[PDB]
């Protein structure tokens, strides 16, 4: 009851095994990667197959695990706003896509609950700091 671990990140909706990259990881902390697999790609079904959503997962007190699929939009639509497939090897030299001012406040607000900052102008920025180091032009 006192033994507990905690940590988990963005897992592609649908991918789990084999061991690499998700094997001894969260596999030597109490929980096994036998199940917990079909206990991820059986809850994250009805969304976007290409959505690396980071589900928060504790560990155990017995042997089992837990699950909570939070909320991308945020990260996605940001890569899929200036070509996610074809990107620039050296971003800052050339471009890949473009976005309007409207679609600047769009990916904004829709992540305020994770993104941190007061005033919308402070939100419109930072994402403008995250603007581009991956092709895409500001204007």
């Amino acid at each position: 009851k006192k033994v507990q671990a905690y940590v988990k990140l963005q897992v592609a909706a649908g991918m789990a095994n084999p061991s690499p990259p998700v094997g001894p990881a969260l596999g030597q902390q109490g929980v096994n990667i036998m199940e917990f697999c079909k206990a991820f790609n059986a809850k994250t079904d009805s969304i976007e197959k290409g959505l690396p959503i980071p589900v928060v997962i504790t560990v155990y007190a017995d042997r089992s695990f837990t699950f909570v699929t939070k909320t991308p939009p945020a990260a996605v639509l940001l890569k899929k706003a200036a070509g996610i497939k074809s990107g620039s090897g050296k971003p800052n030299k050339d471009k890949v896509g473009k976005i309007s001012r409207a679609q600047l406040q769009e990916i904004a607000q829709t992540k305020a609950a994770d993104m941190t900052g007061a005033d919308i102008e402070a939100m419109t920025r930072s994402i403008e700091g995250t603007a581009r180091s991956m092709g895409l032009v500001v204007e």
Binding site: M115, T116, G117, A118, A122, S126
Partner: protein, 119 residues
């Protein structure tokens, strides 16, 4: 109660106890009639003394995060609301908190390794 007794009672009341008090008189008597107590109550030298509660951040610990995290969790700030004031420490982490709350806040910060003093 005796007028003198009332005067002493007000002196004991925390400025919090007197603020809502003057605003209170304001509702009935009105801003006009309640102005007497409002102007006389304010001089509770809470400002003229530089005091007492609050959670002053004397020190915090070589790393932000831990400290700021607690700050962010206690106040609620992004990346320019508890990262341009929590350092010098503008000890005003929070205001108008009871002794227990201020004590609890101090603990959380100390856990993050913040040398806090409670005025």
């Amino acid at each position: 109660i005796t007028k003198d007794q009332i005067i002493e009672a007000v002196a004991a009341m925390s400025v919090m106890d007197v603020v809502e008090l003057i605003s209170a008189m304001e509702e009935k008597f009105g801003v006009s009639a309640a102005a007497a107590v409002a102007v006389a109550a304010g001089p509770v030298e809470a400002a003229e003394e530089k005091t007492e509660f609050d959670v002053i951040l004397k020190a915090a610990g070589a790393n932000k995060v831990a400290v700021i995290k607690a700050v962010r969790g206690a106040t609620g700030l992004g990346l320019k609301e508890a990262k341009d004031l929590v350092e010098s420490a503008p000890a005003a982490l929070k205001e108008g908190v009871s002794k227990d709350d201020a004590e609890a806040l101090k603990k959380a910060l100390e856990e993050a390794g913040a040398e806090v003093e409670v005025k």
